[PDB]
Amino acid sequence: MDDRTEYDVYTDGSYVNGQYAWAYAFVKDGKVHYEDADVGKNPAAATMRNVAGEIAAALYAVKKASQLGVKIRILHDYAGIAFWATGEWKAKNEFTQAYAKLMNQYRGIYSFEKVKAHSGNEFNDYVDMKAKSALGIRDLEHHHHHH
């Protein structure tokens, strides 16, 4: 039906030994509805340094997002994806380009900035701490930064 989240989704940044996997957090009615990841095997996706898997999540995340009639972080989400989205390398570089294409494919529930291609960093791992806020963790502090 709907949701009430306000934190980045658990996507981008995951692998076992040397493979690539994509995961995400689902919530319905403002509560945990689903919970499960998925691994690949294909070479085209297992040859991009397991990068295709990190972004992969954001892909399937939107596709299903339309099924649950819900939406993901869009309000200045940024996330790790917005890291390379600034334009670090030509769009041709790597198959990451497909990402920008898959956007319009299911664009209407989520939002994001311009993502050319190429990548390589821990910008995705950031979702680890962010997602923690959505999952359900306690704390007590008041601080932040800007970039």
Ligand SMILES: [Mg+2]
């Ligand atoms: Mg994201």
